[PDB]
Paper text:
SMYD2 is a critical regulator of numerous cellular processes, methylating both histone and non-histone proteins to control chromatin remodeling, DNA damage response, cell cycle progression, cell differentiation, cell survival, and inflammation. We have determined four crystal structures of SMYD2, including a wild-type protein structure in complex with a PARP1 peptide, a wild-type protein structure in complex with an ethylene glycol polymer (PEG), and two structures of SMYD2 mutants.
L351A/W356A is a secondary-binding-site mutation that targets both subsites M and L, while F184A targets the target lysine access channel at the active site. In the L351A/W356A mutant structure, neither the secondary binding site nor the substrate binding site contains a peptide, although the PARP1 peptide was included during crystallization. Comparing the wild-type and mutant structures reveals that the mutation disrupts the integrity of the secondary binding site, making it less defined, explaining the loss of binding there. This indicates that this mutation disrupts both binding sites, consistent with the L351A/W356A mutant structure, where neither site binds to a peptide or PEG. Strikingly, the L351A/W356A mutation shifts the kinetic profile from sigmoidal to classic Michaelis-Menten kinetics, exhibiting single-site hyperbolic kinetic behavior. The L351A/W356A mutation results in a more than 10-fold increase in Vmax, while KM, which reflects apparent substrate binding affinity, shows a 4-fold increase.
Residue numbers in the entry:
A (entry chain A): 4 to 433
B (entry chain B): 5 to 433
Amino acid sequence: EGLGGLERFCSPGKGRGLRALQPFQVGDLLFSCPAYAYVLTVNERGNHCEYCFTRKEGLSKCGRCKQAFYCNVECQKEDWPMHKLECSPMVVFGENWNPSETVRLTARILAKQKIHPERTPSEKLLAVKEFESHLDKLDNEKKDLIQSDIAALHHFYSKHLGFPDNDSLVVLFAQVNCNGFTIEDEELSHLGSAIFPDVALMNHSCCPNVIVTYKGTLAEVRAVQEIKPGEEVFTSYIDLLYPTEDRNDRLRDSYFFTCECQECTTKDKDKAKVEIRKLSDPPKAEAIRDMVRYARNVIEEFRRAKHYKSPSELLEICELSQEKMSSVFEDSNVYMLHMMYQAMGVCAYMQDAEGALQYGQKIIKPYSKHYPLYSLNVASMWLKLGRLYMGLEHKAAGEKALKKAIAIMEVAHGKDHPYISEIKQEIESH
Amino acid sequence: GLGGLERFCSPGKGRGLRALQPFQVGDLLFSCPAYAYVLTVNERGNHCEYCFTRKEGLSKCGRCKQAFYCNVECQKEDWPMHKLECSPMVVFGENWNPSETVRLTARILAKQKIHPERTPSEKLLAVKEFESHLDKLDNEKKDLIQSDIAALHHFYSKHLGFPDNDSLVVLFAQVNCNGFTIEDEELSHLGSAIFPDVALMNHSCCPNVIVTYKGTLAEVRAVQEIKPGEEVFTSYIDLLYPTEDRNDRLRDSYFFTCECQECTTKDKDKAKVEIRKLSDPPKAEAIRDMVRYARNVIEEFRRAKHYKSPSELLEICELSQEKMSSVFEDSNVYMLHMMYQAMGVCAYMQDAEGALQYGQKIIKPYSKHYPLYSLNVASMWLKLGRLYMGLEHKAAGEKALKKAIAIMEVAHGKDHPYISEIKQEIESH
Ligand SMILES: Nc1ncnc2c1ncn2[C@@H]1O[C@H](CSCC[C@H](N)C(=O)O)[C@@H](O)[C@H]1O
Ligand SMILES: Nc1ncnc2c1ncn2[C@@H]1O[C@H](CSCC[C@H](N)C(=O)O)[C@@H](O)[C@H]1O
Ligand SMILES: [Zn+2]
Ligand SMILES: [Zn+2]
Ligand SMILES: [Zn+2]
Ligand SMILES: [Zn+2]
Ligand SMILES: [Zn+2]
Ligand SMILES: [Zn+2]
């Protein structure tokens, strides 16, 4: 059928999209869409159920592989048609079993089509076969990364899968890299990847009118602005903190397009985001271009460093970069804030909560002013800063920060969402 | 309808343009703004994308950095067309290389979607009415148009509403027949455009008007005496080559055979295929062999420029000129063509002394094979002129430049900007 209040249409310049037929207010559920295929990330095993993504302590372990946990035998046998793709190879390959998460998700996509080749209730407006691939635009270096995924697919998932032509496998991974979703928790921590066909129909905008939240394996779409009949439903694919140039670089790299919304054409927030300190002698333009290029490099340098460097060395990257940037950038600069945010996360892992709160409170005020009204990046930041206070018995500034997240999350997740209950339950704990 | 001219059906040539009032040599028949246009890739940074203004120091486009404008005025004025390529040029990167015909065709579809009514550029012949010569398309020729439709969907599928593939075949066929290539004062390629009213004029190897450009505006000026009732004729091809070579391009590219005075009588075919009668007169078959050889090496040099070094291109000319000099006189148009190519290669190596030695040899016989007012002769005088100005040979330099002014003042007009800059080159001491 068709989702009530919404209609599929061809947006001029954006291919296909989702358009509203009835008015939607801030907080209204536009539609819900169950996952077509989904996988729990490796680092969250034991904390969430494999079948329904229920976070709970004490989960029944899988007898054969011991690396898959369920709430009970109910969720176990329900997940077996998909778990059988990995249960046996995880023990046979042992340490050598390490497929990418995109390959894990793709292997279950092929499995779902094999045991359910007709339209699922997850694709009432956009079938999985209709996913745009951008195959024409794949760079040669990008083509080897997709071929390396097909090689791992045959390497790990050859037991239960009937593989189509290699041409059909290249286009399948291309669609997954464009239409794939990453499930996140309340703290915006990575929980897994999934495919939501009807949700993938919505286009991108740096000033979106809806935000996507998750209730286990079910994706919920809720309006973050006022949506009138005839207006297209827009979401955000990327982190809206960085300037127009940085945003469109991720968009062109990962999705093969350049955003042309109000923010991207006028560069309104580019002044406040690339904020410069107006000392007596204003920094020359070349001194600004050098620091911005320096800031983007060290941000990518920190991403590689986390994979193999000690926490004390990751904190040294932040404190060194902050010194070099503080000569030109004000503390409200998004690059200064990013490094300070990474330093806050490293302190939270070393359980130096006092040091993380000094970073969290410093950045929270300038952080929120660069985001939309109801943003999950701001809500999760208030949650992280909130729960750190509750562990140090600072329940004054703790519940004050938690109510800020609840205010934003009640619009994004909804008032009945389970995340809203647990945060209220954390303020009740005396 | 344009005053002084009328659209009519020429017997044997479909439709054409006919004059109603007398026109003197140099009179502007009409002017026509471009319907769709595109700047060639190799002239970016030298000319504005919107108005083809040649100027140093052009504002670069922030998003793609591969599109230059005079100012933000011309930038946003070209945005309804530039947005078709701005984003894909960065996304595709190195792999973005559509043919210029596809670039121009993609902008035609953009113009018709935001302006489906009659434009002031089609006061006598609409774009929909362009002849297609679809019946005459060879099956192998159909593969080049299908290869262009494939690239059209491949590169311009984001902002374009594509009709049926049948409607796309007929569209590219119209572009290949009615398309124009904008040239500068040296007849160097600046881009492609569509001038509907200008495309109405038929071809003749002795034309009465010549088409010049003032930025993106095409200007038509008479090169002969035009009486009321006479059809307005232009030239589609380079009038240097013999009748057989000329009509081969016409049947290949425009699917017709010219039947003007030159083609029916072959008057200049004797002087163009001039043969030197040494003591033992060259055999008749030896002429057919050298002519076929000369036409082959001309196409052989055409492929070589795309991937061979300039020092190797000069070896192709000097080798062919030696073999041809046994039968052909130095005034032969085939000898002149290779010498013209050698002159251009020497000018790229900045060996202007070596290029001037070729230029002076060919300039006098070159002009005698062309009409009185021909841009091919004007541009040749311009290249020879400014080459002297770089070597401080301003005597023979301004003397060669005054020859271009004589021809260009009739073709381009006395108010044309090209006439001002060359006068500024003689005034610069
Ligand atoms: N704001 C935007 N402007 C132009 N293209 C956009 C866009 N937002 C999304 N897209 C396009 O949509 C793709 C994301 S998947 C979203 C659905 C897609 N339009 C479809 O119907 O298949 C991207 O590859 C991008 O090319
Ligand atoms: N001298 C000539 N003799 C015969 N046909 C000619 C011609 N010059 C042009 N043509 C014809 O006209 C086409 C050129 S495009 C210009 C206009 C065409 N008469 C029209 O109907 O709109 C050629 O491709 C050929 O079909
Ligand atoms: Zn469960
Ligand atoms: Zn198992
Ligand atoms: Zn944007
Ligand atoms: Zn301009
Ligand atoms: Zn651009
Ligand atoms: Zn002729």
